[PDB]
Amino acid sequence: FVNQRLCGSHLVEALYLVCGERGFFYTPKT
Amino acid sequence: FVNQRLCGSHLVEALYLVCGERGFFYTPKT
Amino acid sequence: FVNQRLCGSHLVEALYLVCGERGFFYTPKT
Amino acid sequence: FVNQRLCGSHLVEALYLVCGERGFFYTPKT
Amino acid sequence: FVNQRLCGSHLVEALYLVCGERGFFYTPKT
Amino acid sequence: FVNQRLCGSHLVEALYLVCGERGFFYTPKT
Amino acid sequence: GIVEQCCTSICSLYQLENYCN
Amino acid sequence: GIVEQCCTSICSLYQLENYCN
Amino acid sequence: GIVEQCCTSICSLYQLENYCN
Amino acid sequence: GIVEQCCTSICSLYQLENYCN
Amino acid sequence: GIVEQCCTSICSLYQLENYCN
Amino acid sequence: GIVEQCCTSICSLYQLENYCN
Ligand SMILES: [Zn+2]
Ligand SMILES: [Zn+2]
C-alpha cells in the first residue's frame, strides 16, 4: 500500500478498518 | 446525554469522542 | 469528560452523538 | 443529484454538506 | 447550494452523496 | 488485515484509505 | 419526519434543503 | 461485550467510558 | 458561537449539550 | 483537479457532479 | 460487483485494491 | 507514538497493524 496522513477520528477509523475483529488500542499519550 | 445504537466504525468514533486524550481499547467479541 | 477540537462535519457528528433523539441545531453564523 | 438512504449520523453529515454555512435543524420524531 | 472546503475522506464522502448509484472517480493525481 | 462488511459511504472511506494518492473508481451495480 | 423517511425509505438532497436555516 | 451490546441493543456514553485508558 | 469554541479553540461534550433541543 | 478546488480552495456540490460517471 | 459484495457479504482490503487507479 | 507518525507526519496501513491486538 501507500502512506498517508491520519488525524483525529480518521486515525481511529483506519485502525478499525485494519484491525477489525482483532480489536486495537488507541493511545495518544504514548 | 442519550442512549444510542452504535455499530461498526460508529462505535469507534463514539469511543474517540468520549475518551479523547485518554485513549481507549476497542475489543470486539471472538 | 474532556475537551477537544471539533471542526466541520466532526462537530455535527458529535452533536448527533450527544443529542440523539432530542435533536439539535447547527448554526455556524451565530 | 440522486436519492438515497440516510440513517443515523449519515443524515446529519448529508445535512451538513447540503446546508453549509446556512446551518440546519436535526429533528427526529418522538 | 453553497460552496465549501472538502479535504481527504470528506471529499469522497461528498462524492458518494452527490453521485450515489451513478458512481464516481476520485483522482487526486489529476 | 481482515475481511469486513462495508456498506454505503463506509466502502468509499475504505477505498480512499486503501488507494490513497492512486485514487479509485466507485462503481455500484445498475 | 425527514429523519425517519430518509432511513426507512429514501430521500433527496432537495428534501434535505428544507431543513437548512 | 460492549461492541456487541451497542450494535444489537443500545448503549450509553457512560458505558463507553469504561473503555477509556 | 458553537464554532468559535470547537474548531478554533476546544469544546467539551458537556458544552455540546447546550445545542440540543 | 478536484483537490485543487476543494481542500486548498472551496468547491460546490454542483461541481462535484462533474466527477460522477 | 464489489460495492454489492462488500455490503451483502464481506470483502477484503486486497479485493478493494483492484479498484485503485 | 501512533500520532507522531500519522497526523504530524504520514503513516501506512501496514504500520497501523502494529496497534491491533
Ligand atoms: Zn476530518
Ligand atoms: Zn454507517
Side-chain angles (χ1 to χ4, degrees):
Chain A
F1 292 121
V2 298
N3 294 63
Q4 60 194 296
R5 174 160 296 101
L6 297 165
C7 296
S9 61
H10 298 291
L11 176 54
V12 297
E13 282 286 306
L15 282 167
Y16 167 79
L17 181 68
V18 169
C19 302
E21 58 84 291
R22 301 175 56 184
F24 65 84
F25 58 88
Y26 173 67
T27 52
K29 191 176 302 177
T30 307
Chain B
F1 300 114
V2 298
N3 298 312
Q4 56 274 295
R5 182 184 183 184
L6 297 166
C7 296
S9 61
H10 300 294
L11 175 55
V12 172
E13 294 184 57
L15 282 165
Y16 169 77
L17 290 173
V18 170
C19 301
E21 295 68 59
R22 293 181 288 180
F24 63 85
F25 263 67
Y26 175 69
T27 304
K29 187 184 300 183
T30 63
Chain C
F1 292 121
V2 298
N3 294 63
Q4 60 194 296
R5 174 160 296 101
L6 297 165
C7 296
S9 61
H10 298 291
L11 176 54
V12 297
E13 282 286 306
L15 282 167
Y16 167 79
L17 181 68
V18 169
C19 302
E21 58 84 291
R22 301 175 56 184
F24 65 84
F25 58 88
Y26 173 67
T27 52
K29 191 176 302 177
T30 307
Chain D
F1 300 114
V2 298
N3 298 312
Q4 56 274 295
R5 182 184 183 184
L6 297 166
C7 296
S9 61
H10 300 294
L11 175 55
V12 172
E13 294 184 57
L15 282 165
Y16 169 77
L17 290 173
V18 170
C19 301
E21 295 68 59
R22 293 181 288 180
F24 63 85
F25 263 67
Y26 175 69
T27 304
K29 187 184 300 183
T30 63
Chain E
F1 292 121
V2 298
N3 294 63
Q4 60 194 296
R5 174 160 296 101
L6 297 165
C7 296
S9 61
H10 298 291
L11 176 54
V12 297
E13 282 286 306
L15 282 167
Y16 167 79
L17 181 68
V18 169
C19 302
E21 58 84 291
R22 301 175 56 184
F24 65 84
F25 58 88
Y26 173 67
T27 52
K29 191 176 302 177
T30 307
Chain F
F1 300 114
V2 298
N3 298 312
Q4 56 274 295
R5 182 184 183 184
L6 297 166
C7 296
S9 61
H10 300 294
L11 175 55
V12 172
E13 294 184 57
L15 282 165
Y16 169 77
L17 290 173
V18 170
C19 301
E21 295 68 59
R22 293 181 288 180
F24 63 85
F25 263 67
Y26 175 69
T27 304
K29 187 184 300 183
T30 63
Chain G
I2 191 66
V3 180
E4 296 66 44
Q5 181 204 318
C6 288
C7 185
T8 66
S9 190
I10 56 176
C11 67
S12 70
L13 299 189
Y14 293 96
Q15 292 174 323
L16 292 187
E17 252 199 309
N18 289 320
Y19 298 90
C20 294
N21 301 312
Chain H
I2 191 66
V3 180
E4 296 66 44
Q5 181 204 318
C6 288
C7 185
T8 66
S9 190
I10 56 176
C11 67
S12 70
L13 299 189
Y14 293 96
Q15 292 174 323
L16 292 187
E17 252 199 309
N18 289 320
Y19 298 90
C20 294
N21 301 312
Chain I
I2 187 177
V3 175
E4 289 62 62
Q5 49 186 295
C6 286
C7 188
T8 56
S9 183
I10 56 174
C11 65
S12 68
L13 294 186
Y14 292 125
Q15 294 181 302
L16 292 186
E17 288 274 54
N18 294 165
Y19 306 98
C20 300
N21 288 316
Chain J
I2 187 177
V3 175
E4 289 62 62
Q5 49 186 295
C6 286
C7 188
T8 56
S9 183
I10 56 174
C11 65
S12 68
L13 294 186
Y14 292 125
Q15 294 181 302
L16 292 186
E17 288 274 54
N18 294 165
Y19 306 98
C20 300
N21 288 316
Chain K
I2 191 66
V3 180
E4 296 66 44
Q5 181 204 318
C6 288
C7 185
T8 66
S9 190
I10 56 176
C11 67
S12 70
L13 299 189
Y14 293 96
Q15 292 174 323
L16 292 187
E17 252 199 309
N18 289 320
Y19 298 90
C20 294
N21 301 312
Chain L
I2 187 177
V3 175
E4 289 62 62
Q5 49 186 295
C6 286
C7 188
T8 56
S9 183
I10 56 174
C11 65
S12 68
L13 294 186
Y14 292 125
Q15 294 181 302
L16 292 186
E17 288 274 54
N18 294 165
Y19 306 98
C20 300
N21 288 316

